[PDB]
């Protein structure tokens, strides 16, 4: 519920933020979340404040179970029942990690409907399954949720993202009608393939570039440098020694090319991360520590268990370095 986002001073993934909700989130997020989180230094147990915030974020993420109680069930602090319930609780974890809403949409499914595992229905809603478990819908589930997963993987990863990243900054009441139009276009199973083949090539190039940005963040250029340590020195050798050889002892165009390519060497191997970015969209992080689906008809046998650094945390590495004291 949005009220919970208001309490958490931020955004707990309410769906379909109506207009005044847009207003109130901008207000709350910026003003409050800044002012508190920006520059306070309170004795107000900021450690324990953080603790409350994280132990309150996580339960909605996994629906509504109390996770302090999960902590308490064992005598440890954390990270073990975490890696465990995420190894599987079998509806809230896997069905959402692939294709659903972890909430009582993906719940009650195992209650009444079926997702037979190894053709075996396991209708307990909290199972733990690992190391060789075939996850399969029923057929009367398939004949609808094939279409549902298609309209998900496209309307909610192509359409919404594409009306995002663009058409955006001045007016959203306009991305509204643009979503209307692109809905009319996605109504079409030929438009599908044409879009597969459309100018999204350009956007993927720009995305490669922005990943290169977030890469150069922390030394990709430094390792490029070390890996091509000679080559720049070789260019400098060209320049300086052809100088002290040809003259002052084609020269002008030797200097032309040497200057150009050498200065360009130094530029490309020392441009330090002009970020200045407007916003940042988010990727969908598919699990390939678990095995994929026959996305045609759901048959998504697992092959392994999860790690801790590749999980959809809506929390930065901090406060989860306070919960999961991990490297």
């Amino acid at each position: 519920r949005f009220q919970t986002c208001r309490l958490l001073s931020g955004n707990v993934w309410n769906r379909e933020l109506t207009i005044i909700q847009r207003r109130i989130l901008r207000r709350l997020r910026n003003r409050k979340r800044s002012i508190k989180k920006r520059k306070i230094y309170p004795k107000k147990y900021l450690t324990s404040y953080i603790q409350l915030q994280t132990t309150r974020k996580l339960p909605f993420f996994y629906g509504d179970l109390p996770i302090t109680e999960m902590h308490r069930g064992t005598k440890r602090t954390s990270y073990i029942p975490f890696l465990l319930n995420l190894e599987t609780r079998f509806d809230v974890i896997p069905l959402r990690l692939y294709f659903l809403e972890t909430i009582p949409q993906a719940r009650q499914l195992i209650s009444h409907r079926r997702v037979c595992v190894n053709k075996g229905m396991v209708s307990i809603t909290h199972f733990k399954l690992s190391h060789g478990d075939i996850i399969s819908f029923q057929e009367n589930n398939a004949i609808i949720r094939g279409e549902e997963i298609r309209r998900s993987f496209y309307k909610e990863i192509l359409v919404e993202k594409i009306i995002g990243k663009l058409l955006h900054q001045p007016l959203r009441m306009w991305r509204r009608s643009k979503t209307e139009w692109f809905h009319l276009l996605k109504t079409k199973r030929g438009c599908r393939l044409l879009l597969k083949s459309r100018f999204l090539q350009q956007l993927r190039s720009s995305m490669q570039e922005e990943d290169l940005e977030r890469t150069k963040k922390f030394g990709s250029e430094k390792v490029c440098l070390g890996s091509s340590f000679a080559e720049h020195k070789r260019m400098k050798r060209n320049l300086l020694k052809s100088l002290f050889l040809s003259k002052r002892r084609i020269s002008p165009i030797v200097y032309n090319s040497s200057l150009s390519l050498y200065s360009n060497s130094t530029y490309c191997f020392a441009s330090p991360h002009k970020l200045t970015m407007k916003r940042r969209i988010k990727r969908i992080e598919l699990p390939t520590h678990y095995l994929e689906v026959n996305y045609r008809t759901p048959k998504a046998v697992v092959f392994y268990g999860p790690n801790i650094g590749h999980i959809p945390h809506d929390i930065r590495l901090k406060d989860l370095n306070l919960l999961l004291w991990s490297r």
């Binding site: 040809s246 003259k247 002052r248 200065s263 130094t266 020392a270 200045t276």
Partner: peptide, 30 residues
């Protein structure tokens, strides 16, 4: 001519240095 190119190397390299220096001076704002 080659002395013009040597001072040209000094010119372009100090130019690049100062440009990236101001670039970082601006990136330190955010």
């Amino acid at each position: 001519a080659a002395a013009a190119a040597a001072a040209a190397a000094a010119a372009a390299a100090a130019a690049a240095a100062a440009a990236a220096a101001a670039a970082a001076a601006a990136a330190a704002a955010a």
